[model samples]
Target chain A: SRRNPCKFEIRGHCLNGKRCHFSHNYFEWPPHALLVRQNFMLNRILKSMDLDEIDGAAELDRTEEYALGVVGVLESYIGSINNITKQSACVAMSKLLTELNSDDIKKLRDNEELNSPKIRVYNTVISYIESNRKNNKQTIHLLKRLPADVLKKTIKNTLDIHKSITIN
Target chain B: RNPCKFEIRGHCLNGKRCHFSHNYFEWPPHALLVRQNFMLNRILKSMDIDGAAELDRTEEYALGVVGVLESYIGSINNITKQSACVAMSKLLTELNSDDIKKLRDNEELNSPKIRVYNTVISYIESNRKNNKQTIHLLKRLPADVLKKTIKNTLDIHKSITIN
Candidate 1:
């Protein structure tokens, strides 16, 4: 198979052990450090995604859903204390958000579980901006690239969620 | 005899016949290290709450003390190297644009700053365990130093592909 090695496989445990699309073979590869392994996995994840539009009004397909699964994986890295990892995650997210259209955004918002990651990311970006750190330009620009309505609505929803949790 | 106050600060008020000792080296090694550690802690504490601007207020004294800490970055003692590395990282993080400019322009500070930069690069290249702190120090380096260091330390000369 031409498919690259699975990240989980490299880590010694593949969740999709039965019928994984990614290669299970690791013997061919040289010994690698943690950072090298992460780089290899991220590259493979990116390659697995197929984001070319079939039509303007077409519904989200299995391929797109698989692509979004990649986004979810990227989201996990957003909160890492490691600057290199955090920056990589944010950069990947910004690129993905730019590629995904308004229709996809609406679909994501309508889904209960799927939108959770987006809300968390928006919260993180806003929190970072409010802190007035020097590295906020890229995150600020990420929000700017997002559709106006999506940005406003997601922020409002996040605020409401915060308010409800605090209420006695 | 007690150290001369004026001589400690600069020249002695009474040069020839002063009762207090004019030489700082007269102090015991332990006493000197204790005093140096206190000064470093004081600077780090002030810089923590007030940023590098506080250091700017007492520029000459603070820079000299920090330079003393910089010298220990290459110490054979692991504990001394560790403390020095931590202090250097904090100092680098707190340094602002103006502070960095002062570092370059000040005659006394420039050489130590250059040495610290080189030592940090060397640490990154050779030491695997301390790479985290060294990389943190690298990121917070002055803009020009960071640019040159990256070119030498991280920039690749050629690309390789495997089939």
Candidate 2:
């Protein structure tokens, strides 16, 4: 048989690397890639803020003032993260929270559990934030605000679901 | 009473024990005291940029722009100290000749001798590729003329000093 250079043949079957061909499992790359992409994007966004404007408050224009306000919320969120994990998540969270607030987080919070695409994005962010929290304060607050049955169901489901995944 | 047996201790005005005794009526002198006070009351003349009915726009612009460069250089110095000279040189070459002229006229830039400016510029150009700060500073320059003048000043220094 003439061999196809692009195809990987193992045990009389072709393994399609580009799309789908062989019966083989591959790691999910998108989630991890997205995490890294978001991390860099967040860093760039935060660093681009004119810190001089924050220092010289009197000279700040309206846009600068708004940016500073968003920065303040992000700083708070990052501080909260630090209290949970002594890592430098403040810069990233500040950027993310600033964007979230700019998109009207108050309105988004009203319908965050609907499983819609927007809510999914919000939930992903929330889950990431929760995973990084060092203490139970934030989780407790979240649980208290959630519907009792939904919160119970979530806790039960997460406890029942187990995966042999090890992360470094 | 034997003279050798007699012991004397001096006292200060406040009745504190004196550390030393003087032979004459004058008090013992401080070890390193020297009156070096400078009086500057005669040199207090003032000049005003706005003294004329209208300020010279060109001069004002030059001053303002140079002032910005001076501050930028000052900041580099603050962060890196003497190491900033190399960075300053890189920044000079990146700028145009006209901008370099303005920097050259700055009081801080001129406060150093001509030799220093030449050395700084030479150091910047020769090692421009390796120094990141110099490249960063150069990116902030406004004119090519200033950059050329700064380089010329460096070359002049090289001619005067073998190094």
Candidate 3:
């Protein structure tokens, strides 16, 4: 009577390096080697980010809005990123804020001459997005959709307003 | 562009001063701001507690012995905030002696815990000796949080001082 070979292959040392076998005479058929390998791989991928060193209270302090003006600014940035990255839109908005200066943000808020808080916020975020794209060698196609003069005016206004706010 | 400051000189169309101050924090005290601060503290403390719990859970599940020991140390730091510290200390006290002994034999595990313990014990002992120093430390913390931490520490000391 002939014995059946093991269904799952196990690496074994043989005289010829490539001639390893799975004979039922030496081991049980259908050995669970594949299942073990699968479980090992599965465990490696589901690792969590390190949260132990994270400062929760400090994080909240950084996120709270100064007033309605700050809230509108953040909201507009979030809206723009939502169209591109969807799931990571909020993350992108946070990154943009991290890159911007507090003085610049305050100037944008105090620009009453613009008369449109929503437009000021939207334009700043859009400009940041365009610059980010240019740096990454991505297409600067989004710039074409918005008016050039309006965008230039918004940036100039932000710089002027910030200087005035900071000087005082 | 000049940095301009607005000065209130006369009444507005509504017969109120254009620059009228609301006096949100009046002489009697504003309960609304107090409540807001309380809720914010609760949310932040809860997030810290959850982080500590998740770390412990991950270590136990992964059978990472060194990680679990580190998690125990991390939990103490997380609970340094007054609202969560007592509960964390209670949990810390419940750790198995045998597991701790195992970690004690491992130099990597033993050193970090000893270092953290010494630092914390020094701070606590120093604070206990000097009320002025305690007030100085309290100045760095929010008033309500400092009060809660002192209250918890006192309660814990009362029960354990004799032992």
> Mind giving the per-residue lDDT tens digits that candidate 3 earns over B1-163?
1111211111011112223332222212233233334334333322332223332222242423323333333453223332233333333333333343443455565576555344334445544465345435544667465444444343333334443
C-alpha lDDT of residue B14 in model 3: 12
Worst 10 residues of 1 chain B by lDDT: B154-163
What are the DockQ scores of the candidates, in order?
Answer: 0.01, 0.00, 0.01
lDDT of 2 by residue, B1-163 (tens): 1111001111011111213332111222221111000001101111000112111122222333333334334452222222223334434444343333444555464465554454454545554445555534544555453344444454544444452
The best candidate by lDDT is 1
lDDT string, candidate 1, B1-163, tens digits = 7664433322232224457674443544343333344334323332222122222222222333245343343332222333443444444443333333433455465565556445434553433445455645654666456445433222111110110
RMSD of each: 28.7, 34.6, 25.5
**Candidate 2 chain B superposition, TM-score:** 0.21
Return whichever of 1 and 3 wins on lDDT.
Answer: 1
- Tens-digit lDDT string for candidate 3 (A1-168): 444444332222224434534452344433344332222222232121101122221222232221212223334333442123221222323333322343334334444345566545645654554454334212122322336455344434443433343344
The lDDT of each candidate is 0.39, 0.32, 0.35
User: Which runs of model 2 end up more than 4 angstroms from their true locations?
Assistant: A1-122, A125-135, A156-164, B1-163
TM-score of each: 0.17, 0.15, 0.19
Better of 1 and 2 by lDDT: 1
Second chain TM-score, each model: 0.22, 0.21, 0.23
